[PDB]
Design a protein around this ligand. Structure first.
Ligand code: HEM
Ligand SMILES: C=Cc1ccc(C(=O)O)cc1
Ligand SMILES: [Cl-]
Length: 393
């Protein structure tokens, strides 16, 4: 028997403090039913990991949001990677893997790190800053659009579009419908920048379009793959870096450990991704009747995976609610897991690592010195405003 809960995981009260409700979801049973939206829910690490690693049964091509693409028209053309199952997912996935490859990271790392150091220096000259707008947003905005090969004009559309995308995975609540109402200009800009002539030589987009002659993708698939990078490539890392700075501000002992050994930067970022889980949730749809956690789930059912809860499951993690920069983080699902596991994770980890290295070498203290404001999104967890004072080393 599967327990029925009335918790709305997409309510503003849930977003404000999801951890008690995530414990209630976990402790109710391995599989729950959320009556509010008529979906199954999995909040423990084990069931989330199992669902993510069974794309045949728990598919993505009927949408990874609440909407079932077999029942409703998608709000935009389906992503050729995120909203695709194998085998159609495989070759676009490969192209994106080679575009955001170790070699590409080697080409861009010196500039990403230089830009992170310069940003921390500028903020240190300012002293009191907003760690969201002036850091978590400003740094990825300073490196990622250029690495894409985007022109300067119209970049102010990138964060709104992203927010829209992440709101659109949610249920048809006020956040989602409001997002879609305001979507037209951001959609117009983003779809336009996806065309080959609009992507500067040597950038991620130009490389995607250059990969259109190997038999893995065709030229008509390249704009949508550039669209994938313009959908996920900025906002997720904004909330990851914001998560990390929020953690270092809340856990000064961990900031002191990070200063003492800056080579912990990468893991300090990885732990942040586990601790806050900026991408909180994703859906799957059952392609057949399946037994999961002793519960029978019929065909065509939406299954809501709580990635943040899975990353705080005490069945899997010791002291899951502590931020520990030397934690063995391998296995967390903040980047997903399986065939869809974040293809841009090397970029995200590069940005987070070099930013946290900059803070580790340059900043003595991070003190919250203003009202903290949360940003509400159906899929992303993160702050709207994080006022901090940076004491230089
Ligand atoms: C802290 C930063 C990030 C987090 C937490 C994050 C999270 C995730 C998660 C959980 C998934 C799995 C989706 C699923 O299983 O349905 C995913 C997939 C994906 N992410 Fe990331 N992401 C981040 C950064 C990035 C970046 C920087 C890029 C591109 C430059 C990117 C592009 C993508 C794409 C294209 C997919 C689809 C992968 C696939 O379906 O095979 N993401 N991301
Ligand atoms: C992880 C978020 C995400 C959003 C959009 C896409 C896409 O548009 O393919 C991929 C990942
Ligand atoms: Cl679009």
């Amino acid at each position: 028997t599967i327990p029925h809960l009335a918790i709305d995981p997409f309510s503003l009260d849930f977003f404000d403090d999801p951890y008690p409700d995530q414990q209630t979801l976990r402790d109710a049973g391995p599989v729950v039913y959320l009556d509010k939206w008529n979906v199954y829910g999995v909040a423990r690490y084990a069931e989330v990991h199992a669902v993510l690693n069974d794309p045949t049964t728990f598919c993505s091509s009927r949408g990874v949001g609440l909407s079932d693409f077999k029942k409703e028209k998608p709000w935009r053309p389906p992503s050729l990677i995120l909203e695709a199952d194998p085998p159609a997912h495989t070759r676009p996935r490969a192209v994106l893997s080679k575009v955001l490859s170790p070699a590409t990271m080697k080409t861009i790392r010196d500039g990403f790190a230089a830009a992170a150091d310069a940003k921390v220096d500028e903020l240190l000259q300012r002293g009191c800053i907003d760690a969201i707008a002036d850091l978590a947003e400003a740094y990825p905005l300073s490196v990622f659009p250029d690495a894409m090969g985007l022109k300067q004009e119209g970049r102010e559309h990138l964060l709104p579009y992203a927010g829209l995308v992440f709101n659109a995975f949610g249920p048809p609540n006020e956040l989602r419908q409001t997002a879609i109402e305001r979507s037209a200009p951001h959609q117009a800009y983003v779809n336009e920048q996806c065309q080959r002539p609009n992507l500067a030589p040597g950038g991620f987009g130009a490389c995607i379009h250059a990969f259109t002659d190997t038999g893995e993708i065709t030229p008509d698939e390249a704009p949508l793959l550039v669209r994938s990078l313009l959908s996920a490539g900025l906002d997720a890392t904004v909330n990851g870096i914001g998560a990390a700075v929020y953690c270092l501000a809340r856990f000064p002992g961990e900031l002191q450990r990070l200063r003492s050994d800056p080579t912990l930067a990468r893991n300090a970022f990885e732990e942040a991704v586990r601790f806050e889980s900026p991408v909180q949730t994703f859906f799957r749809t059952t392609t057949r009747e399946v037994e999961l956690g002793g519960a029978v789930i019929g065909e065509g059912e939406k299954v809501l995976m709580f990635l943040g809860s899975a990353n705080r499951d005490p069945r899997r993690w010791s002291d899951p609610d502590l931020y520990d920069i030397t934690r063995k983080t391998s296995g967390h699902v903040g980047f997903g897991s399986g065939v869809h596991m974040c293809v841009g994770q090397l970029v995200a980890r590069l940005e987070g690592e070099v930013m946290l290295s900059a803070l580790a070498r340059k900043v003595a203290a991070i003190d919250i010195d203003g009202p903290v404001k949360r940003r509400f999104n159906n899929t992303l967890r993160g702050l709207e405003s994080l006022p901090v004072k940076l004491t230089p080393a």
